[PDB]
Design an enzyme around this catalytic site. Structure first.
Site, PDB file in Angstrom:
ATOM      1  N   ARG D  90     -62.386 -14.616 -23.869  1.00  0.00           N
ATOM      2  CA  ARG D  90     -62.458 -16.014 -23.396  1.00  0.00           C
ATOM      3  C   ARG D  90     -62.199 -16.133 -21.889  1.00  0.00           C
ATOM      4  O   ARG D  90     -62.923 -16.771 -21.137  1.00  0.00           O
ATOM      5  CB  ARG D  90     -61.447 -16.863 -24.145  1.00  0.00           C
ATOM      6  CG  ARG D  90     -62.028 -18.225 -24.519  1.00  0.00           C
ATOM      7  CD  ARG D  90     -62.164 -19.226 -23.378  1.00  0.00           C
ATOM      8  NE  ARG D  90     -60.887 -19.863 -23.134  1.00  0.00           N
ATOM      9  CZ  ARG D  90     -60.761 -21.195 -23.076  1.00  0.00           C
ATOM     10  NH1 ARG D  90     -61.822 -22.017 -23.186  1.00  0.00           N
ATOM     11  NH2 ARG D  90     -59.531 -21.703 -22.887  1.00  0.00           N
ATOM     12  N   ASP D 150     -68.239 -33.571 -28.554  1.00  0.00           N
ATOM     13  CA  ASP D 150     -67.635 -33.439 -29.856  1.00  0.00           C
ATOM     14  C   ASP D 150     -67.181 -34.746 -30.469  1.00  0.00           C
ATOM     15  O   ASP D 150     -67.288 -34.928 -31.684  1.00  0.00           O
ATOM     16  CB  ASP D 150     -66.508 -32.439 -29.698  1.00  0.00           C
ATOM     17  CG  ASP D 150     -67.015 -30.983 -29.770  1.00  0.00           C
ATOM     18  OD1 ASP D 150     -68.188 -30.737 -30.128  1.00  0.00           O
ATOM     19  OD2 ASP D 150     -66.205 -30.095 -29.465  1.00  0.00           O
ATOM     20  N   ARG D 153     -70.162 -36.008 -32.075  1.00  0.00           N
ATOM     21  CA  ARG D 153     -70.401 -35.345 -33.376  1.00  0.00           C
ATOM     22  C   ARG D 153     -69.442 -35.887 -34.436  1.00  0.00           C
ATOM     23  O   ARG D 153     -69.808 -36.085 -35.587  1.00  0.00           O
ATOM     24  CB  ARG D 153     -70.227 -33.807 -33.277  1.00  0.00           C
ATOM     25  CG  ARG D 153     -70.943 -33.204 -32.058  1.00  0.00           C
ATOM     26  CD  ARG D 153     -71.672 -31.901 -32.320  1.00  0.00           C
ATOM     27  NE  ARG D 153     -71.303 -30.936 -31.336  1.00  0.00           N
ATOM     28  CZ  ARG D 153     -72.108 -30.060 -30.729  1.00  0.00           C
ATOM     29  NH1 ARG D 153     -73.419 -29.965 -30.856  1.00  0.00           N
ATOM     30  NH2 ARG D 153     -71.508 -29.248 -29.876  1.00  0.00           N
ATOM     31  N   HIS D 177     -61.514 -28.557 -25.720  1.00  0.00           N
ATOM     32  CA  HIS D 177     -62.854 -28.458 -26.270  1.00  0.00           C
ATOM     33  C   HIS D 177     -63.305 -27.195 -27.036  1.00  0.00           C
ATOM     34  O   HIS D 177     -64.307 -26.572 -26.698  1.00  0.00           O
ATOM     35  CB  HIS D 177     -63.773 -28.815 -25.046  1.00  0.00           C
ATOM     36  CG  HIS D 177     -65.250 -29.149 -25.330  1.00  0.00           C
ATOM     37  ND1 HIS D 177     -65.775 -30.121 -26.088  1.00  0.00           N
ATOM     38  CD2 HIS D 177     -66.315 -28.402 -24.830  1.00  0.00           C
ATOM     39  CE1 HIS D 177     -67.086 -29.984 -26.070  1.00  0.00           C
ATOM     40  NE2 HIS D 177     -67.393 -28.956 -25.314  1.00  0.00           N
TER      41      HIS D 177
HETATM   42  N1  LIG Z   1     -69.660 -29.655 -21.915  1.00  0.00           N
HETATM   43  C1  LIG Z   1     -70.127 -29.482 -23.143  1.00  0.00           C
HETATM   44  O1  LIG Z   1     -69.529 -29.985 -24.100  1.00  0.00           O
HETATM   45  C2  LIG Z   1     -71.375 -28.583 -23.321  1.00  0.00           C
HETATM   46  C3  LIG Z   1     -71.900 -28.241 -24.584  1.00  0.00           C
HETATM   47  C4  LIG Z   1     -72.894 -27.260 -24.710  1.00  0.00           C
HETATM   48  C5  LIG Z   1     -73.346 -26.577 -23.567  1.00  0.00           C
HETATM   49  N2  LIG Z   1     -72.828 -26.881 -22.274  1.00  0.00           N
HETATM   50  C6  LIG Z   1     -72.843 -25.921 -21.109  1.00  0.00           C
HETATM   51  O2  LIG Z   1     -73.888 -26.111 -20.118  1.00  0.00           O
HETATM   52  C7  LIG Z   1     -74.058 -24.837 -19.434  1.00  0.00           C
HETATM   53  C8  LIG Z   1     -75.519 -24.377 -19.481  1.00  0.00           C
HETATM   54  O3  LIG Z   1     -76.061 -24.312 -20.821  1.00  0.00           O
HETATM   55  P1  LIG Z   1     -77.607 -23.927 -21.053  1.00  0.00           P
HETATM   56  O4  LIG Z   1     -77.903 -23.842 -22.506  1.00  0.00           O
HETATM   57  O5  LIG Z   1     -78.459 -24.844 -20.261  1.00  0.00           O
HETATM   58  O6  LIG Z   1     -77.579 -22.453 -20.424  1.00  0.00           O
HETATM   59  P2  LIG Z   1     -78.675 -21.378 -19.982  1.00  0.00           P
HETATM   60  O7  LIG Z   1     -78.032 -20.042 -20.125  1.00  0.00           O
HETATM   61  O8  LIG Z   1     -79.965 -21.655 -20.684  1.00  0.00           O
HETATM   62  O9  LIG Z   1     -78.828 -21.696 -18.405  1.00  0.00           O
HETATM   63  C9  LIG Z   1     -77.714 -21.717 -17.486  1.00  0.00           C
HETATM   64  C10 LIG Z   1     -78.239 -21.860 -16.058  1.00  0.00           C
HETATM   65  O10 LIG Z   1     -77.217 -21.543 -15.077  1.00  0.00           O
HETATM   66  C11 LIG Z   1     -77.926 -20.865 -14.024  1.00  0.00           C
HETATM   67  N3  LIG Z   1     -77.070 -20.102 -13.089  1.00  0.00           N
HETATM   68  C12 LIG Z   1     -76.373 -18.978 -13.331  1.00  0.00           C
HETATM   69  N4  LIG Z   1     -75.827 -18.490 -12.205  1.00  0.00           N
HETATM   70  C13 LIG Z   1     -76.199 -19.367 -11.265  1.00  0.00           C
HETATM   71  C14 LIG Z   1     -75.687 -19.452  -9.972  1.00  0.00           C
HETATM   72  N5  LIG Z   1     -74.916 -18.542  -9.400  1.00  0.00           N
HETATM   73  N6  LIG Z   1     -75.990 -20.567  -9.268  1.00  0.00           N
HETATM   74  C15 LIG Z   1     -76.747 -21.533  -9.789  1.00  0.00           C
HETATM   75  N7  LIG Z   1     -77.249 -21.461 -11.025  1.00  0.00           N
HETATM   76  C16 LIG Z   1     -76.965 -20.388 -11.794  1.00  0.00           C
HETATM   77  C17 LIG Z   1     -78.934 -19.967 -14.719  1.00  0.00           C
HETATM   78  O11 LIG Z   1     -79.898 -19.363 -13.830  1.00  0.00           O
HETATM   79  C18 LIG Z   1     -79.410 -20.893 -15.851  1.00  0.00           C
HETATM   80  O12 LIG Z   1     -80.669 -21.585 -15.691  1.00  0.00           O
HETATM   81  C19 LIG Z   1     -73.131 -23.783 -20.058  1.00  0.00           C
HETATM   82  O13 LIG Z   1     -71.940 -23.431 -19.308  1.00  0.00           O
HETATM   83  C20 LIG Z   1     -72.865 -24.408 -21.425  1.00  0.00           C
HETATM   84  O14 LIG Z   1     -71.654 -23.867 -21.983  1.00  0.00           O
HETATM   85  C21 LIG Z   1     -71.889 -27.927 -22.188  1.00  0.00           C
END
Ligand SMILES: NC(=O)c1ccc[n+]([C@@H]2O[C@H](COP(=O)([O-])OP(=O)(O)OC[C@H]3O[C@@H](n4cnc5c(N)ncnc54)[C@H](O)[C@@H]3O)[C@@H](O)[C@H]2O)c1
Ligand SMILES: NC(=O)c1ccc[n+]([C@@H]2O[C@H](COP(=O)([O-])OP(=O)(O)OC[C@H]3O[C@@H](n4cnc5c(N)ncnc54)[C@H](O)[C@@H]3O)[C@@H](O)[C@H]2O)c1
Ligand SMILES: NC(=O)c1ccc[n+]([C@@H]2O[C@H](COP(=O)([O-])OP(=O)(O)OC[C@H]3O[C@@H](n4cnc5c(N)ncnc54)[C@H](O)[C@@H]3O)[C@@H](O)[C@H]2O)c1
Ligand SMILES: NC(=O)c1ccc[n+]([C@@H]2O[C@H](COP(=O)([O-])OP(=O)(O)OC[C@H]3O[C@@H](n4cnc5c(N)ncnc54)[C@H](O)[C@@H]3O)[C@@H](O)[C@H]2O)c1
Lengths: 318, 307, 307, 318
Positions: D90, D150, D153, D177
């Protein structure tokens, strides 16, 4: 009515009924809107004015009609009613409006209509019970506006006091809709926190909350003193209840519902939280009022009961 | 006004101004709505009634104010007034204190006669032409759209049609530039057994609709309350949407130095550009004739104003 | 389906079907949405993801189902597929169980190649022509609107313009019937220094946009998920709105017994009527040539699966 | 940005950022939307795809950009992150995402940007605190998505159990979370009635409610098992918080906010009811949790704070 086409009939084209129709046109709810009133030319002029909103909002078939147009309607909204004159008694408002109502309901039902009634004519709890009684419809197919307007005014006022959106204030006005009614503060919250605690925390005393509640209770009177009539709040409330029905939402709204034990009440319509959907009232939700608030509610209901029954007794004094 | 917070001031709280305010409340456009009129009690009462729409629509700060409240407003909508002379008089009492408040947003003018009062609002305010927009033929164009829509069983929003000329009796349906699904309305009409006479009666209905609604119920305001909300939306959501508005003629249609109804692109800075509808020679003659009386009356009223 | 409760069944839960469902959830259109696809674990997971949009948009009963759930559906949207022969094969596996469920609402067909599969959905279902609507050139017409809007600093919704021909490479911008504020796009172009060559390059951009988006991010689905939500809205809110769809040709444009893209009026019973865009002689030749090829490939594919 | 024209910059164009942008396009919120990501051609292809939604929704200037485009932006939404791998700890999820974040925030601030940050990258409470810390912005101008997904949900689940619209379920998921989080049932209501009373009343046991809460806690995991990724719920939640900001609503939403005593917590960002408006977070509202629920919240917070400081400590180890 015909495929993917919902039909609302408005009975009563005064300022309430008309601002309701305009709200329904701005919101694109229902595809056909029939305007019925004894003043037929009024209904032809309002359908023409209203239908001009369509070029910039959503298409709607709006026209002037008659009670027979209720045949295949999904919703009939009754806003028709006379105002209380100077020198006139409360029981006489009841008397003339029960008379007007009995002239509306029987032809509406004889058209073959079997959708839902939404009743907003004053006094609304009495006239909603009488619409149920005169129509012979199931209780869930007759819904009154109950305390929806005044609950919105309490939400607007608490929202203003606490710098919150009114839609985030979970608060209800309870009791029969006028002077005996009260803010159910014990079951009221903002962000799940009790309104009284938010109040105390922010320097708003229970006296201040009492004055606020008074403002809400007097708001109709003050708007009528300033501009002559009040209709935007109930036109909106009637659109929101119509939306919960026509978009089958099962939304929780302040409406008037038939008491079957709730709050210790029986055989009256009165304002409650309730779940509203495509078949009408799905279920009543009893707000867990404090002992003081429940006494107020039962007192208010007891006298509403008395006036409902005098009115009905006089209507059968032939 | 303050962060992410748009401010509209309505001057003129009669049935037009008030149903506009209600339409803006149902639509959630702008966050603060000030109501200004001479009769203060009416505006105080209308702000209270209007604000109750919020529990079931969207939050809005609605209240009764004064011209000084225009200071940091984004849009001032002028619906005030009662004729050319009395309305020019009422207008001159509104515009000068609105500009002296420090207001520098956009004027939307709907007070009648609208083309004359829109030009006079431009003249009295000293604002750029693009920051003074009139309702022009937006209401009657909507009524044409509703009527063609009804005739041809089409949604009014899919009827691309304009009423041209100065907004009353000398105005006409610009049928030569009107279409439904890109097909000319006259061809659709032929194809369906609707004669040019039928289209002339339909145009007459539109021209007489205000009169007929006033005869049936006393007043007409829902169509222009909606039209004013649609133009306000194009401005405040910076849409560059094409709308029927009143704009300053600078050569278009062979006209100069009057405001009159045109298609135009409307956005966050006001009128972006006028679009000249390619009118038939007959329709252009009617437009220029209609426009020609305008210039005389306007100027009679502006010169009258200064004596 | 049950009182004041509309029901849509989506067959095909790939990126197009799924972004359509998301657009329908943001828009609050229909009260029940069933997702049907070969891979049940994808549809299960998408229903769960999609239903989370409800706390902040509008309630909707979204779940994973089967063809039998089409029984009392109002609209079945077919986005399923994989060329002419494999998609006709997939289609014939979808339509027959959808009709055997007792479904008798409207089909909206978006699976590619869309004109051929829309005709085949009409042919395999045995439904009336008006109850089988294809997406036709709605997506590419939107891309033309976006591009002319961008070129002329106008909202795309104020560009009245259609892509015509069969949906790919033989298709063209129907510039002769295209307008902004009722003025012809070629005149607006000439007035603003945009040459017919520039318009030809613009039209090329639109024709290549799918290819370019697939090259940059792998797939393209937002535009057609939106267009399918707009056609679904015109149906379910009985609008009689004019939209670009695929409709059965019955003489229009000199064409017969093929589905192809047209302006048409769409309402609660399906297609109300086709509107024949008054194309220039050149544009009509292009349309007829494009159609002539569609029509060969259609009857070849259909003769192939009749073996 | 320029008159009557709001500008949002999205940093992170994966499935979350992209479905957020699509939700913003369907809703007509903001007039200019910039897409920024290290994968530039993906932001170009998505802007092209997204802008096609305009012919049938509302005009929006959507394009691919860089951090310098944040200069006059009103809102920057950070969804950029790397996912947790099998076998990875984690704290290593925290570690790489703190690294990614530090590469985003500094150029965003150096562009001259001074609007609001909305942070959704996981783990969201840690990364929202770190965005505050790295930007040097006021706490109210840095808002995290906290428990908004959440909590939705939970609302969907209680709505489904009790045949109510999810928007009428006043219920929050509290705690940090994931897995240590819980349903704050003691402050949860439907039509002002306590969810536990509605439950008891309808034959839904506290065990049933515990299973329901487990479903909510496992829903991300289940969606990822069925279809590979989960993004529609947080794309919508991010649009709803953006709407409360850009339409200055002072709406009460589940967000992540800086604890300054509330719930007995300090110097962490965590999920709370709060009022959101045009200047950012207007005020935190402390849900009056039961003693059991508050213990859960404080334990969850204690461990988040531990991981927070471990990660920030390793980011300082050069
Ligand atoms: N807050 C919430 O409750 C919630 C719930 C689900 C997902 N999300 C989060 O949203 C985020 C993205 O999810 P996703 O499914 O779109 O992911 P994904 O893996 O499809 O895409 C993540 C993006 O971050 C970019 N990235 C990585 N390094 C980079 C950098 N140095 N600078 C700029 N951009 C860069 C990647 O190139 C990519 O397009 C995650 O951290 C995920 O956990 C939030
Ligand atoms: N329920 C609420 O909370 C709420 C709040 C405020 C007002 N309203 C009520 O709505 C009703 C109407 O108000 P309004 O502003 O429209 O009033 P209004 O006086 O302007 O118009 C009332 C309409 O009733 C019609 N009417 C009277 N007798 C008729 C009859 N016998 N048959 C058919 N129509 C007839 C009139 O012709 C008129 O158009 C009132 O009873 C009023 O108190 C409801
Ligand atoms: N442009 C259009 O196409 C269109 C169409 C129909 C009506 N309207 C017009 O809009 C205007 C209002 O229409 P209405 O039906 O609401 O009429 P109205 O006279 O009831 O309302 C206008 C209000 O302006 C107020 N007013 C007068 N002098 C004022 C002053 N000096 N400062 C501030 N307020 C003042 C009055 O108190 C009056 O009630 C009229 O001129 C009308 O013809 C516009
Ligand atoms: N008409 C247009 O203008 C337009 C534009 C772009 C894409 N689309 C089309 O829509 C379709 C879907 O595109 P996508 O991007 O989602 O790609 P995709 O390949 O992911 O989607 C096709 C879907 O059909 C499914 N499928 C196959 N057989 C099926 C069956 N028998 N029953 C149910 N489902 C079945 C697949 O599993 C898949 O989910 C394609 O044919 C595509 O070209 C339409």
């Amino acid at each position: 009515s015909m495929p993917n086409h919902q039909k609302v009939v408005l009975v009563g084209d005064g300022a309430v009924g008309s601002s309701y129709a305009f709200a329904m046109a701005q919101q694109g709810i229902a595809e056909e809107f029939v305007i019925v009133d004894v003043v037929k030319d009024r209904t032809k002029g309002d359908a023409l004015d209203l239908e001009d909103a369509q070029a910039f909002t959503a298409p709607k078939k709006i026209y002037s009609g008659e009670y027979s147009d209720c045949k295949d309607a999904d919703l009939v909204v009754i806003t028709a009613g006379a105002p209380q004159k100077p020198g006139e008694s409360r029981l006489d408002l009841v008397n003339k409006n029960l008379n007007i109502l009995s002239s509306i309901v029987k032809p509406v039902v004889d058209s073959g209509f079997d959708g839902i009634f939404l009743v907003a004519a004053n006094p609304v709890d009495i006239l909603t019970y009488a619409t149920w009684k005169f129509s012979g419809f199931p209780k869930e197919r007759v819904i009154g506006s109950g305390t929806s307007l005044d609950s919105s005014r309490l939400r607007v006022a608490l929202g203003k006091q606490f710098n919150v959106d009114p839609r985030s204030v979970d608060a209800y006005i309870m009791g029969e809709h006028g002077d005996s009614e009260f803010a159910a503060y014990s079951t009221a919250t903002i962000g799940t926190r009790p309104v009284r605690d938010v109040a105390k925390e922010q320097g708003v005393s229970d006296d201040d909350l009492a004055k606020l509640e008074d403002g809400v209770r007097n708001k109709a009177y003050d708007i009528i003193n300033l501009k002559g009539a009040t209709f935007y709040g109930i036109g909106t409330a009637l659109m929101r209840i119509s939306k919960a029905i026509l978009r089958d939402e099962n939304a929780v709204l302040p409406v008037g519902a038939y008491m079957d034990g709730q709050y210790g009440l029986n055989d009256i319509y009165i304002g409650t939280p309730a779940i509203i959907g495509g078949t009408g009232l799905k279920q009543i939700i009893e707000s867990p009022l404090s002992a003081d608030e429940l006494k107020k509610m039962q007192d208010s209901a007891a006298t509403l009961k008395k006036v409902l029954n005098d009115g009905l007794a006089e209507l059968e004094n032939k």
